[PDB]
Amino acid sequence: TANSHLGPLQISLGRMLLDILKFLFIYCLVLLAFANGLNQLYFYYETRAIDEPNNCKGIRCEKQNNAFSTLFETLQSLFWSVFGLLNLYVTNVKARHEFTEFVGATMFGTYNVISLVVLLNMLIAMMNNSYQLIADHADIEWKFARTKLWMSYFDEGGTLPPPFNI
Amino acid sequence: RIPLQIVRAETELSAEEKAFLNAVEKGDYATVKQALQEAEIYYNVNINCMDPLGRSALLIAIENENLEIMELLLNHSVYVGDALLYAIRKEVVGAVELLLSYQFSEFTPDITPIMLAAHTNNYEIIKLLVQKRVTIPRPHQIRCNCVECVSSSEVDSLRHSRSRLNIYKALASPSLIALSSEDPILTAFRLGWELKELSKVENEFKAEYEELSQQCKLFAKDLLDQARSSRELEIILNHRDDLAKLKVAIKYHQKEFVAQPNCQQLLATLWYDGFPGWRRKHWVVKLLTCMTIGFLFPMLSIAYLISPRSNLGLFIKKPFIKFICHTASYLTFLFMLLLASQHIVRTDLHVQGPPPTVVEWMILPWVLGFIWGEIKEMWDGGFTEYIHDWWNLMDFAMNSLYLATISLKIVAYVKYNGSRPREEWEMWHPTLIAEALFAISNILSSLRLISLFTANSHLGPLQISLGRMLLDILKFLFIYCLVLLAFANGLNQLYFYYETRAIDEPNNCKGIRCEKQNNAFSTLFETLQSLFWSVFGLLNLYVTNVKARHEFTEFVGATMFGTYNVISLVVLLNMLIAMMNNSYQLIADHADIEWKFARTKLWMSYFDEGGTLPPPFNIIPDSLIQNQHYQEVIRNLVKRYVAAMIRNSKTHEGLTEENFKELKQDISSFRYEVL
Amino acid sequence: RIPLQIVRAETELSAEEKAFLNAVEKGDYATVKQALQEAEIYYNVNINCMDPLGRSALLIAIENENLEIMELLLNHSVYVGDALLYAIRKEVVGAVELLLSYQFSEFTPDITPIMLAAHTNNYEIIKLLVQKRVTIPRPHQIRCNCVECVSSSEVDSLRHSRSRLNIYKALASPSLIALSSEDPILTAFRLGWELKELSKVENEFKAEYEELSQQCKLFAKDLLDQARSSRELEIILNHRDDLAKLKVAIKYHQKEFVAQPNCQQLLATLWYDGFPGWRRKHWVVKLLTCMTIGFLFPMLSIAYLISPRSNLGLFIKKPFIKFICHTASYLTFLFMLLLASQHIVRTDLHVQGPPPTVVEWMILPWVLGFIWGEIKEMWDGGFTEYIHDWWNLMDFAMNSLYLATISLKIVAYVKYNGSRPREEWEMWHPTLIAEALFAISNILSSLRLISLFTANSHLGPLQISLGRMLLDILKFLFIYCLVLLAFANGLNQLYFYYETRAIDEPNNCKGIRCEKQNNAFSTLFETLQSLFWSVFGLLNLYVTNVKARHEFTEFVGATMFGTYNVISLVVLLNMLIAMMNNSYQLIADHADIEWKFARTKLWMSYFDEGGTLPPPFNIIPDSLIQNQHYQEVIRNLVKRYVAAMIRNSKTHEGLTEENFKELKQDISSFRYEVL
Amino acid sequence: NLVKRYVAAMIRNSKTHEGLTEENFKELKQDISSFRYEVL
Amino acid sequence: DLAKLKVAIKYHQKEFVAQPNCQQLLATLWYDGFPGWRRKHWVVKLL
Ligand SMILES: CC(C)CCC[C@@H](C)[C@H]1CC[C@H]2[C@@H]3CC=C4C[C@@H](OC(=O)CCC(=O)O)CC[C@]4(C)[C@H]3CC[C@]12C
Ligand SMILES: CC(C)CCC[C@@H](C)[C@H]1CC[C@H]2[C@@H]3CC=C4C[C@@H](OC(=O)CCC(=O)O)CC[C@]4(C)[C@H]3CC[C@]12C
Ligand SMILES: CC(C)CCC[C@@H](C)[C@H]1CC[C@H]2[C@@H]3CC=C4C[C@@H](OC(=O)CCC(=O)O)CC[C@]4(C)[C@H]3CC[C@]12C
Ligand SMILES: [Ca+2]
Ligand SMILES: [Ca+2]
Ligand SMILES: [Zn+2]
Ligand SMILES: [Zn+2]
């Protein structure tokens, strides 16, 4: 805030943070719904770490497995699928249950569409709308913030820096 | 180098006619008199002479708003046809009264003086005309096949449409409505609805009908803002042709009427029945009261069942308490659904037909209550209204899935008796199908919780805006689907010659859901799935390679895939983003009105006494005086609105013109007195 | 329940003073006379009485623009102080002439009549004042340490700043400039430059100085638009204090002056020297002429070297031909660079110090020509201007890389003699370093081709807009770098305990550029690289796992990585997109002016006769009469501009006030004549 | 001082075309009526 | 010492605080030991 070029930008970003927090609620509700559904579908096919290669279990292994066996793991998998770090073979069970595998794949695809095609674009649109209004009064807010920052060094209390103030 | 001439020459009048027109325009009470005498005697002047710009002497006098010359000409029997319309358009009460006291035109031949006055919206001239027992034609139904309508549409469609539009524009006049209607609010509601419905049948003249409907809605609202007392507001809102007028306004989509601050205060007072000074409390104590009232939902309900007249039994009849209890019940149902898929309560995954567990036994009554409530609401309240909600579709799908799950479980329990390894079950085992349907219904039931966002001041408008953008998302889906189908057809045609069996693949896995993806374009279904999954980057690049060394075919397939990727990810998504931004820009203006309309609709569903108990517990087995009061209040509101609009009509241009005319009249009078 | 009173009471005047003020306001040539007589004799009235709203009788008369009372009061010796300023502000020439004929204020005590007239921009009053030999103070340099400036800034900074702003606002008046300057265009250029430079030193009053500079630029442009002949335009543009005035305008950043249509036509006529009717031809034939002229670039240059006076040798002296030849030469150089890295011309990749190949031998003269041209341009044309281009930086980097490559090749050839397998060479082999530098310089030289886009009507504005957004991209880079450093520090601190040697890893590969990524967070450099590459999704999720079973540490690392991913990819990029949109919205308005300024700057570099030959071939070894003409044209332009502005000054409010005052005067005269 | 300056500035800003036109029209009407009465 | 300015800050008077005359006074107080700070070049200020 002490700089003439970065201060207004920082104020604007801090002003948009609240609306980011607003979208977080809807995203969390959608995530919880789909996690509940996927865990309910897939909890019958849990496997122990002994039978997996390298004795590794979860989605942080080189060969991802047991992605939807527990609610916590399902939440983590659905979070990491936002950035594309979950592979497509995690929807396959060891047995040949093609109906179950297809239903799980359709659930995953619907979640991907809803999360990555709709919600993010709506977030971008309302970010643009918020910034349009915020950009008008950037100077006044930045100068108010800089005045508040300056006034904290006028008084004579706490003159010494923390290494020397004890 | 070509000269300019006059092609459509106008037949000029003689010097006598030019002098007469000049004298009439300038103003000479004696020169015009002697000119009329000369026209009478020697016929030197035509009494019906016309300006080349279609402006007779009477029209010149009318535009000069001097009444002496007009009265003299009327006494001299000049052609007076189509002059009352000019007087009305100029909005001169004295001249209108004068003509009412007894070729080329600027008005279409279907326009009447009353219709023209209504188009102008001048209360003084409309009242003067209506005082003489005038009438206005009323048009036929929107979809009418009568011979007269068919013949009129078959002879002159332009004339027919113009006449209909003129009649509706006259009927939609606020001053005419206030003067001639006994229920102006109801008339405005119905007229706005009819104009809105007509705008989509006459698609060519859509904007005119839209503006007329907006005018009617604005008139109704502005009439509502003239209430000065809670008693007057209650008289207006409770008038039955308990809040009958508010229900009618909701039915007719009067969002600005419903979202007015005086109505919202009354609705909030009704909503917070048992919490006087609710907005006085702190958010922390309000939150804690919410939690405590929520936890006591099993009680307050048994109390209502065993003693409705008791002090405890009358608590659940309040709307806010009822809403909190229903929300707590739904949250409990969702918590049990969460408990269903855990290790604590469900074990022994090896039985073919399993008896229901304790969690499923607990779940069943909630499902029965949901189905019973849906059926009861659909019966009592209107069948055609039940489908115009877009949430009842989700309710229907969820309940159908639950019913199918229960039926499949019963069928499996009846048919199968024993145990068998799950790995050797068939593809279409009833237990597997029931599990899949249960999971899908769980997803839907969890997603239902969105509709409770409209009750909050921060999430409601956002939810309304997203629901408004969904339609344009649906619009883009069509183009995307067509492009996807085209490219899938091409890729499948290219690659269908190189299909391989699952035996020769590693792990005996075939498709793109294997660890090593293969046969991505061997069938149309698989090609569609692959092209769908390539949108998110989950398809690898080696799927375009065939086992043989056909480099031309592999390159053509890779180029097809690259062109599809470019078109889908570089063009269509960015266009979607752009039009999302454009839609949100317009949507953000009216978010408050739409959110308040939605919240009013949500609140009004808890006012009635039907369906008080939540689903778990709901399966256990004078007029004349009111008319006079309404008429008095309507009189007061109309008088106040007319006075306010008249005082608002004072404008600089009108005041300057009036002062100039008055100064000219006084100067002329003083000059005449001096002379 | 507290009463309202008057706290800052005003000392009222007596009934005599109130009556005198009422008579003065109403207007009574005799009543005011007898009141002044009474004040003279009995002292019943104060001649210096003041309205409670600081409005003396003279001020009332001035606001009433009646001169008889003012003349009588002046004859009666009333306090006349600070009345000329009110007359000037009201802009009444008759009253201004009257006062020029011989406490509380609304004006700051530093304001002079000439400064106030200049603030008003009234030509008639400014001329009247300047006719009486008035002066205006001139301020000190922008950065001045003289004692008088230091003392003034140390006593009253508010007064000092207000006085400086008032002086500059007076000096920036178009009417004052036109009246008192002999070179209004040059004066406007210099004043706009000074105000623009001052706006960033007085950062508090930035907008005022910006508006003053914009006013000066607008005045200069509008003066230019008053030319009626090509001879007048050439006289204006070629005036030397060959296009000296245009070069000065370019130096002072006068974009609206340069982009005016009359100037652009002259520049285009100069640019298309050898193609009369170039815009008459079809785009196909123009394109074919471009290709043929491009292919003949080796000729037209040898012809210019061996016979400058010949018909063939004079062709390359035209600007468009010179531009085409330079472009063709650069394209040939780039084609040879492309040929350098092919299988046809380069073989035997096993020699330590290799002699230069034929392609490198051909490449060397182009590099020598580029360096020689850069040095020659930097010497001849100004050293400080050479750095304000932002393309000369790319030129310098590219030529430095080429020089380093040549030096390293020579050093390697001298030092090494023999052959050795490339797999056992050291890390810092001179041949390897030279190859890397050559590749980087190839990238830079290929990227240089962007600067030719400004010559096209479709790509130029787009290139200007992108170059305008680059600065705000640079602004976001800082915040991104800080966040990246914070998270890299945290992750390296968490994970530095689990480093492993390359021996124990498969294939003896260590880092994230291996097929199995490992040691992603073992060092700070590797952590920075991993966090950079995770922006594009090229880092796998198993890099957060340690070889031991430390689940708490692995979970903490995964949560750190997830938080970084959310912050970087969900928040910062979307904010960047939003502010990109906001910047482009404002940039898109003035794209044409900026593009035409850039194209003019590009065109003007080919007009001079220095550096005619392309780099491959450029290493082979009266004043008084002009002043009178300019003065005459300036007289004509100033007269036309003043007349146009005066005719534009006719406004409805002014005309209405003038007509009202004239009618009042005539009515009063007629009433007096009757009486 | 500040209140006096602010009030004077706002009063001088209150001068508007509509108000000035209405005032001039009323004053002209009054003067015309006075002249007519004097003549009569 | 700037009691009224502190009250204005407490009451969120952003337009009052950001006025140019107040900002000049605040800058004068802020640059106590560097008279003519804005006169210097950015390089020497940085050093
Ligand atoms: C992106 C990387 C390089 C960050 C490295 C961390 C630090 C070296 C940076 C981070 C934030 C920087 C600060 C950001 C802003 C300012 C205010 C700045 O004050 C002004 O610019 C005063 C003049 C004006 O108002 O323009 C003085 C440097 C300082 C403290 C900077 C000092 C260096 C800091 C601490
Ligand atoms: C994102 C995760 C935590 C969702 C978890 C599911 C439930 C715990 C949430 C989802 C939606 C929530 C509801 C959303 C909105 C409201 C309205 C709210 O009413 C008000 O805010 C009234 C006062 C006002 O108008 O501001 C009362 C809580 C309630 C029912 C919430 C109760 C808790 C619910 C059911
Ligand atoms: C995208 C690929 C094909 C680039 C290949 C590199 C070159 C073949 C291109 C890159 C930029 C091009 C230049 C961009 C713009 C111009 C200006 C252009 O001039 C006009 O258009 C003048 C008429 C007008 O003002 O519209 C003449 C061609 C030229 C030099 C182009 C010549 C061909 C160049 C060097
Ligand atoms: Ca329902
Ligand atoms: Ca250069
Ligand atoms: Zn009909
Ligand atoms: Zn000085």
From Swiss-Prot, chain D:
Domain of life per record: Eukaryota
Expression sites by tissue: Expressed in brain with higher levels in fetal brain. Found in cerebellum and occipital pole.
Compartment(s) where it occurs, according to its Swiss-Prot or TrEMBL record: Cell membrane
Disease: Loss-of-function variants in TRPC5 may be involved in a mental disorder characterized by maladaptive behavior, anxiety, autism, postpartum depression, extreme food-seeking and hoarding behavior, hyperphagia and obesity.
Family: Belongs to the transient receptor (TC 1.A.4) family. STrpC subfamily. TRPC5 sub-subfamily.
Known function: Forms a receptor-activated non-selective calcium permeant cation channel. Mediates calcium-dependent phosphatidylserine externalization and apoptosis in neurons via its association with PLSCR1. Acts on distinct neuronal populations in the hypothalamus to regulate innate behaviors including feeding, anxiety (flight/fight/fear), socialization, and maternal care.
Assembly, per entry: Homotetramer. Heterotetramer with TRPC1 and/or TRPC4. Each subunit in the homomeric ion channel (via ANK repeats) interacts with one copy of GTP-bound GNAI3; the interaction is direct and activates the ion channel. Interacts with TRPC4AP. Interacts with NHERF1. Interacts with MX1 and RNF24. Interacts (via C-terminus) with CABP1. Interacts with SESTD1 (via the spectrin 1 repeat). Interacts with PLSCR1. Interacts with PKD2L2.
Protein name stated in the entry: Short transient receptor potential channel 5
Species the sequence originates in: Homo sapiens (Human)
Native organism taxonomy: Eukaryota, Metazoa, Chordata, Craniata, Vertebrata
Residues of the full protein shown: 719 to 758 of 973
